[PDB]
Amino acid sequence: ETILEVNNVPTNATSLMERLRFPVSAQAGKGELCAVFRADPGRDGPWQSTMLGQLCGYYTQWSGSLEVTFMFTGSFMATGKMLIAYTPPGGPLPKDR
Amino acid sequence: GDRVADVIESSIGDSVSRALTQALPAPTGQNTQVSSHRLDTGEVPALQAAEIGASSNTSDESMIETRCVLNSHSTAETTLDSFFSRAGLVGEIDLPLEGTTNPNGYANWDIDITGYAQMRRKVELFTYMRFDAEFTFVACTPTGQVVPQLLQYMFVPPGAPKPESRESLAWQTATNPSVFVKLTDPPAQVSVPFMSPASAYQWFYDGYPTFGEHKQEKDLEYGACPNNMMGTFSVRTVGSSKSKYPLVVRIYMRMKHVRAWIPRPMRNQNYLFKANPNYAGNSIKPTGTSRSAITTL
Amino acid sequence: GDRVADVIESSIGDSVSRALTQALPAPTGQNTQVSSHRLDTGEVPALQAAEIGASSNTSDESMIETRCVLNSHSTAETTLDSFFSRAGLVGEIDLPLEGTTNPNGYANWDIDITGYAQMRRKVELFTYMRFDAEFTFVACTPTGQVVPQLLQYMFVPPGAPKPESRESLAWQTATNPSVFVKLTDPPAQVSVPFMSPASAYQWFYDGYPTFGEHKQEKDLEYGACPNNMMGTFSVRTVGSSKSKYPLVVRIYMRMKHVRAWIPRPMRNQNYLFKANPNYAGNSIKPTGTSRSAITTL
Amino acid sequence: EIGASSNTSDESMIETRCVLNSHSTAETTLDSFFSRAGLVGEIDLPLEG
Amino acid sequence: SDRVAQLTIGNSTITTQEAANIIVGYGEWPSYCSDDDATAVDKPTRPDVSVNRFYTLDTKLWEKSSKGWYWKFPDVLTETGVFGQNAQFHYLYRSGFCIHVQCNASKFHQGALLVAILPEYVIGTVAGGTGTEDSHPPYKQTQPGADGFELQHPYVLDAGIPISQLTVCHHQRINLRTNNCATIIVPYMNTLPFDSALNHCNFGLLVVPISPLDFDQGATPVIPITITLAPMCSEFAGLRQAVTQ
Amino acid sequence: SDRVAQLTIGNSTITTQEAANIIVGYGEWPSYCSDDDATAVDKPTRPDVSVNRFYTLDTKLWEKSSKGWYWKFPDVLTETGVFGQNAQFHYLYRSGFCIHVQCNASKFHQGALLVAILPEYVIGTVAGGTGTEDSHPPYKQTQPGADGFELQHPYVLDAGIPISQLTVCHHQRINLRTNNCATIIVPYMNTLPFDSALNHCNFGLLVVPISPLDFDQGATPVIPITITLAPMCSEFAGLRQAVTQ
Amino acid sequence: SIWYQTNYVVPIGAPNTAYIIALAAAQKNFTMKLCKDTSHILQTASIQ
Ligand SMILES: CCCCCCCCCCCCC/C=C\[C@H](O)[C@H](N)CO
Numbered sequence A: 001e002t003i004l005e006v007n008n009v010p011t012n013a014t015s016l017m018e019r020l021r022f023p024v025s026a027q028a029g030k031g032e033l034c035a036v037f038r039a040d041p042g043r044d045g046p047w048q049s050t051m052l053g054q055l056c057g058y059y060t061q062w063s064g065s066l067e068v069t070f071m072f073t074g075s076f077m078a079t080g081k082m083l084i085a086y087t088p089p090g091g092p093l094p095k096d097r
Numbered sequence B, C: 001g002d003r004v005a006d007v008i009e010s011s012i013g014d015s016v017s018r019a020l021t022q023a024l025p026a027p028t029g030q031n032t033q034v035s036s037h038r039l040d041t042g043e044v045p046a047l048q049a050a051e052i053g054a055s056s057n058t059s060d061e062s063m064i065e066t067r068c069v070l071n072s073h074s075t076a077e078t079t080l081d082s083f084f085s086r087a088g089l090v091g092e093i094d095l096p097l098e099g100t101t102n103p104n105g106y107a108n109w110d111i112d113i114t115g116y117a118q119m120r121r122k123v124e125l126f127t128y129m130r131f132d133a134e135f136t137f138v139a140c141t142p143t144g145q146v147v148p149q150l151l152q153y154m155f156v157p158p159g160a161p162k163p164e165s166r167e168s169l170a171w172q173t174a175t176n177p178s179v180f181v182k183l184t185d186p187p188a189q190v191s192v193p194f195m196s197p198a199s200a201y202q203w204f205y206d207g208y209p210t211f212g213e214h215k216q217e218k219d220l221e222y223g224a225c226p227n228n229m230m231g232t233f234s235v236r237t238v239g240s241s242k243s244k245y246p247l248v249v250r251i252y253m254r255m256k257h258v259r260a261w262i263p264r265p266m267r268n269q270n271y272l273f274k275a276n277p278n279y280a281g282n283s284i285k286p287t288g289t290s291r292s293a294i295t296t297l
Numbered sequence D: 001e002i003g004a005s006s007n008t009s010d011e012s013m014i015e016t017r018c019v020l021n022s023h024s025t026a027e028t029t030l031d032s033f034f035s036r037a038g039l040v041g042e043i044d045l046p047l048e049g
Numbered sequence E, F: 001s002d003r004v005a006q007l008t009i010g011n012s013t014i015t016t017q018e019a020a021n022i023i024v025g026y027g028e029w030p031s032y033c034s035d036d037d038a039t040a041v042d043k044p045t046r047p048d049v050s051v052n053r054f055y056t057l058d059t060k061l062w063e064k065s066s067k068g069w070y071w072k073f074p075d076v077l078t079e080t081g082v083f084g085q086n087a088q089f090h091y092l093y094r095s096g097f098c099i100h101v102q103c104n105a106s107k108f109h110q111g112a113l114l115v116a117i118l119p120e121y122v123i124g125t126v127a128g129g130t131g132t133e134d135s136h137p138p139y140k141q142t143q144p145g146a147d148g149f150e151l152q153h154p155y156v157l158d159a160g161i162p163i164s165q166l167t168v169c170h171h172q173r174i175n176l177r178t179n180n181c182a183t184i185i186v187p188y189m190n191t192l193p194f195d196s197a198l199n200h201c202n203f204g205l206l207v208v209p210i211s212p213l214d215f216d217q218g219a220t221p222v223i224p225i226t227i228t229l230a231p232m233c234s235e236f237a238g239l240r241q242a243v244t245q
Numbered sequence G: 001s002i003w004y005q006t007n008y009v010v011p012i013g014a015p016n017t018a019y020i021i022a023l024a025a026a027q028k029n030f031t032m033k034l035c036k037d038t039s040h041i042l043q044t045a046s047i048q
């Protein structure tokens, strides 16, 4: 299990460690959107920061399942819930939950 | 897990392929048996119904008076490994000195065997084909003259970085397969495996490969099977400076271990473009030759 | 008919009702066993979690020091055949001489036992009930006086032609069941079967009975179960001329062979209409009685 | 935080079917990944220089 | 070994660490109809993983002065997914359910919710208040959809019946100091083995705060409630064109 | 004992008295995918009677100067029924088919139709006529729906291939003096065990009059052709929201 | 995609914003095929 750079927004050298963790905050409870990322490892994006996305670059055709493993680094007294949806192909970017 | 009767007596989940037919060994042509006159009613084998769509089961033992003819003629030359295991020009790359097409001593060629009419028309008799291949490169000057020159034939699979120049970085061939050859030596020759993500190639893809709102701009994607884009073939004159001989690389593909599915009508009009069943409209040639009348020859 | 493994190992079509519970015989109340002091850790039966939604399994053998009490108290009076087999006024029909409600010597009464509060509140403890019944008609003058008069009690099932008058045609009772009685005789009494198209009556129907665009005009159909419209009950003074005694028919329904499903909260507000769980809004009475404070009584 | 990876299969997360996988692991070996010649060096022997 | 639960039905999953338990309604697990209870001769379709999965409806904001919300079933799933298309195209329907109510809050928040399942929950009106007008509720209030409808008189549940005796039904509590989820499993409850989904709502889900939500200033004020429900052992029969209502 | 046929699949039925026979395509009956050919691990839904039934698309008028019509499959069933909703909601698809073409006429009418099934029937253009413009067909002509599209050059089938060699495919004739129906059964033909229904059309149905319709004045001039088709052994997998194309 | 189901609830005195770390891997059924040269990394010249 290697770190996925979902938050690949920051570009300058002083903020390249902000790229490994994405935030969750207090919202108004409308079912907002936190983050979305494509599930293509050999593609150019978050998976290029993995040992799967660097070794699948040395190969052309892949098969089998994946697994993303999210970890919460907030307080102990904090609680909450998240929906982590895999939208198969054809589905555009979902507009709501 | 099954209690109701409308799931015990169900034909749901039958995975076996219920076949009506059975492949029988036919090493020779069929022998003819002796036949005499028939003058009976009800037995009428000359009368068929093609509306059924099936072909005639009529033998010549039923239509004429025949003799015994032990046929020892073989069916071994109509097989596919005897029909496709014959090398043909699938591509041709030119490496001029001065020009515009490839003036930098390198050339890339997207792998398609749908660029020469005489080899396209054979594979397009079937719609799915699964084969290992055997490529053969025949390098020479335009004048046919052979020269003392070294070349690099790099296979660039899809996604791998395409070489932009003669002195580029991709030519180091750490994982991409490459072949070095001198023009004075015999032609190179490599055997390729079946390299598709699917179970078979397909020369006709009835559909669009991506999703999305299909408009006039993104229309050229119709018919593109990306299971068939097997990559890119690249050539350079191995060197840091420009060459002094113009070259022409010819590629000859032979199939082996062939399998094929779902035959098709074979074409009769002249091809015009690659991976495109287009034709000319005002000049629609008939399949054959004309006559003056139907009663005369 | 089953080849794949995702249909052999399927729990599709399981028709058996997997029950966690088992009905055990409980003819008497539960006997108490002897209990002594406990001074241990881990065993803590007084602590429950009602967040689980289940009730407490705490006995008094676990909370106090108890004695053996062989309880021989019966549970036979809390059954449904002991709780519903008690006749009550479900309806009341009046046959005046001069008036406006029923001035022609005949009266129709749509069968609903949701017209008197004291019998409605018992059946509306459950939402599905299946029962045979036993009706009993108690005819009399308004003054309680009994008179020498003959009557006809016709049961008109749904679809059958309702009688429009005293001298109508439907009173010939060729297929409709009817009962003739004199007022001097004892009350009539008939046993009715379970007559529903369904498996049980239901006093609450959450939904509309027809399809269609549900608007403000056709709103009163909300809550109408047509599985429960068992018909119409009709009365006349048997004769060609007008009577000379005013009458009042009272109907008393006793259930037997009762079964019931899915208990409900019992009502606390005063009913207002028939087959309608409406209530008054400004006058919402609490379930019980008030106090001055919580520490005082 | 244990540092070990997930032991979670897809038989535990979704409703799955039997898929007899006959895909080989023979191309991820090291003799299949390193037995591919590459340019490690390049020497030049000019006349004047 | 009991506070954690994983509910996997279909292609969906719920993971919870502050569970109470799983209530099976009336001691019955959902099932398919038998050859004896069934009367329809037409073969029913049993889409086993495309409709039998969890659907998330909406989110309701619990405030200090929240009186309650109700949702009618399966009105909530008539415009949502492959369930709400097989039902528009078919005339019959038979499914259990597995409801799951989420309300996460801190250890400095306090409150409770009664999450009850009332079968055949007919809706009344105040009848003009005085009790003299024979009124009936509109259609947006009897079958309100996935958005739900807010109880205006929760003490009588807008039906004349009390909230105190509702614990005779299926129920769980959501006590924010013990748990944040309530899993109720409901079989098919009706007199008929198959019934229409667009006209008849078999039961109603009631979410009522008995104890009001209280917290101190500085904490998180927005505390949502979220309903997540799964059909189970669904069956459809009688196929004709599509109708919404 | 052969001119009569009754095709009962699902809740639909066809009765014919002037049948030829039933062609099973390439000697293969439709089936469900095996555990070896399948790669997707997700369980597929098998709606067995709600989509596996006959659908009637449209009616085409055979005239004296009718050149031909083609329909792509399963583009014809993307806005029609429970098939065209499970397919919009799922990403994969796998079904055989049973096509049935009706053309009834008298015993004083004469004509013939070739009813052929051409797999992977890619569509070409005349390329400006002169063969110099690299053109491609529009979307209404490649996936034309249930209305079909009229062949403008039937001799080359709008693909450069001849109509004479089309009898190597599945085919029947409709000879109005012998028969008025053509039943073709088609298995799933593709390199992939499952494939998308909204992007890939597996085969095309061609209806071409070889012999023109002729009749004498006074008879019935309006002679329709009617396509009626049934999925068979359908399977769907990979469930997400609804997309039209 | 990742969607807030209910919300991120926090008491007083704790920080109002958190962070999530995603970790990606593969299963036991994963396979690769047809070795090539990696494309998403380059090299400017004049090495040493
Ligand atoms: C050292 C050089 C080796 C060169 C090897 C090249 C790889 C060839 C792979 C197999 C080619 C099969 C032909 C494939 C189909 C064509 O692209 C057609 N256009 C498909 O429609």
Ligand SMILES: CCCCCCCCCCCCC/C=C\[C@H](O)[C@H](N)CO
Pocket: C111, C112, C113, C114, C133, C135, C153, C154, C155, C177, C178, C179, C190, C192, C195, C201, C202, C203, C204, C228, C229, C230, C233, C275
């Ligand atoms: C000779 C006269 C015989 C009269 C017999 C009358 C038939 C009675 C049938 C059973 C009645 C059961 C009560 C049914 C339910 C009520 O209508 C309620 N309003 C249902 O909600």
